[PDB]
Amino acid sequence: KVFERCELARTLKRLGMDGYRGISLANWMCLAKWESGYNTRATNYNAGDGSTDYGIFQINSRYWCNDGKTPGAVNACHLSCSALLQDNIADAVACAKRVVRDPQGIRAWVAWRNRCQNRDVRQYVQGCGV
Numbered sequence: 434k435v436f437e438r439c440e441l442a443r444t445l446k447r448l449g450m451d452g453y454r455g456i457s458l459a460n461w462m463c464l465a466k467w468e469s470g471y472n473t474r475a476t477n478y479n480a481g482d483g484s485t486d487y488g489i490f491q492i493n494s495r496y497w498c499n500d501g502k503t504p505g506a507v508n509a510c511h512l513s514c515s516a517l518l519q520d521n522i523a524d525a526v527a528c529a530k531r532v533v534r535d536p537q538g539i540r541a542w543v544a545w546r547n548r549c550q551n552r553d554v555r556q557y558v559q560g561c562g563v
């Protein structure tokens with residue numbers, strides 16, 4: 434599923450993302466935009482370490498989910514990476530929350546640092562009623 438902007442804004446809000454561990458909704462929106470273009474079945478293979486980035490938040494298999502084919506990986510979110518390719522994003526949101534509970538927080542994603550950090554991201558939620 435490829436979400437419309439405001440459609441995603443309200444979906445994330447209903448899932449408890451607005452201000453989670455201090456991260457505004459607009460930051461979560463900006464992250465999803467640059468990571469996947471709001472596409473829940475987006476995937477990216479990294480031949481180097483045999484890992485794959487899954488879903489709307491492009492969460493990596495070396496640490497967060499199990500796909501069975503990533504050498505010496507772990508499963509911190511305790512989910513099959515398939516759960517991160519569902520049209521319903523509740524499981525992906527639970528995993529993104531687990532990711533930010535680590536030391537780096539939202540900085541865990543390099544795309545956030547490049548396209549969202551030190552910028553006014555309010556434009557991602559403007560007009561969505563959130």
Ligand code: NA
Nearest residue numbers: 494498506507
């Ligand atoms: Na894994």
